[PDB]
DNA sequence: TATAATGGGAGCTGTCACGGATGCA
DNA sequence: TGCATCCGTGAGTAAAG
């Protein structure tokens, strides 16, 4: 379904605090902020789709995002939240996509 | 939900097939339902003040302590409960009975309660001399059930009694959601002095707490039933 | 890179017979 | 166990064009 003016904002503002969150997460862990990206969506998508990105120094298979979860997983828990902030940022980039889907159709039939 | 109508069900609370949700709602499955963007947030704040009030010995029902609706006195007669300081009158009517403070430069030098049963016989900011009437207190009068009276110290004097009560209660005041506002608190929960409610886009409308109290979301803009 | 924009158009047609797979009663 | 019904497929050679 289409959004409502607030759904719209909502979920534009969770995008925009998921990916401060990464930023932090790599800040804390020293990690890579991509890989981090990678690892918190391949969790929100599931292990359906898990795939060796191009830009990542590491080939992304379950085995290495279940060590990053679990190095994740072990953070204290003022640091733990922004995990649990990228998840839901990458929900709502989902959820955004989807409902926006419709628009692409009506600009593209005029092409 | 339409504009401006309220949930007749709570936020967190589960739900059964058919139970209607709202006063043009009804919930298709069972389940958590769920608040979507509540528009106003109604905030308790909580008042811990001491307040005072002369009654006849006689009319009195002497206890420790009073709970809301419970009787406090029963007079034969109509009785005027007096002022026993001068000042400005600051008058403080809550949902049903209300406070008077007297301020003599403009510090209070009384603060009274008046439960249900007494009107009050004075207008905000009038000025009154020792010994005139206050309020009128006709037949029974009885604690309101906004406000609770913790402790009770009593003192006779004469005919009367002066009672100085340790009174417990809350205060409600609206704060309107825009679309541009999330709200950061769950629903009960307490705040503090300087807590965030609502965040909004730049800080000058932001909600924080003046002071501590208990936060209370209505009107959402939908349910989402889980 | 910033008003808002939120589900598509074209079908187009005088066989024909068979063989084999699907669909009902 | 038997029928109607539908879908796919094939329908002459050389020449020029």
């Known amino acids: ?3 409502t003016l607030e759904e719209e904002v909502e979920l534009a503002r969770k995008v925009e605090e998921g990916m401060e969150a990464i930023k932090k997460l790599s800040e804390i862990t020293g990690l890579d902020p991509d890989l981090i990206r990678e690892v918190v969506r391949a969790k929100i998508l599931g292990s359906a789709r898990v795939r060796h990105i191009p830009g990542l120094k590491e080939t992304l298979d379950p085995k290495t995002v279940e060590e990053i979860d679990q190095k994740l997983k072990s953070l204290p828990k003022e640091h733990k939240r922004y995990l649990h902030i990228a998840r839901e940022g990458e929900a709502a980039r989902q ?5 926006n889907l419709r628009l692409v159709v009506s600009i ?3 092409y | 939900l339409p504009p401006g109508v309220d949930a007749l069900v709570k936020d967190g609370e589960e739900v059964v097939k058919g139970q209607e949700l709202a006063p043009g709602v009804v919930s298709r499955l069972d389940g958590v339902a769920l608040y979507r963007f509540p528009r106003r947030v109604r905030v308790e704040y909580v008042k811990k003040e001491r307040a005072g009030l002369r009654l006849p010995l006689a009319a009195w029902v002497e206890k420790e302590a009073y709970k809301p609706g419970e009787i406090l006195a029963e007079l034969p007669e109509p009785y005027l409960f007096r002022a026993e300081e001068e000042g400005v009158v600051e008058l403080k009517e809550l949902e049903e009975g209300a406070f008077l403070v007297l301020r003599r430069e403009d510090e209070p030098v009384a603060t009274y309660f008046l439960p249900v049963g007494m009107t009050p016989l004075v207008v905000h900011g009038e000025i009154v001399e020792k010994g005139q009437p206050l ?3 006709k037949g029974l009068l009885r604690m ?3 406000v609770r009276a913790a402790q ?4 006779e004097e004469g005919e009367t009694v ?5 009174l417990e209660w809350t205060e409600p005041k609206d704060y309107r959601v825009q679309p541009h506002m999330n709200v950061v608190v769950p629903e009960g929960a307490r705040v503090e002095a300087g807590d965030k409610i609502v965040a909004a886009i730049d800080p000058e409308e932001e909600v924080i707490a003046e002071a501590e109290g208990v936060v209370h979301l209505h009107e959402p803009a ?3 039933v889980v």
């Open chain 1, 95 to 99: 959820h955004l996509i989807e409902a």
């Open chain 1, 108 to 110: 593209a039939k005029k």
């Open chain 2, 144 to 146: 309101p059930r906004q």
């Open chain 1, 1 to 3: 379904p289409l959004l």
């Open chain 2, 162 to 166: 002066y009672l100085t009560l340790f």
């Open chain 2, 222 to 224: 939908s349910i989402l």
């Open chain 2, 135 to 137: 309020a009128e207190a």
């Open chain 2, 152 to 155: 009770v110290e009593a003192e």
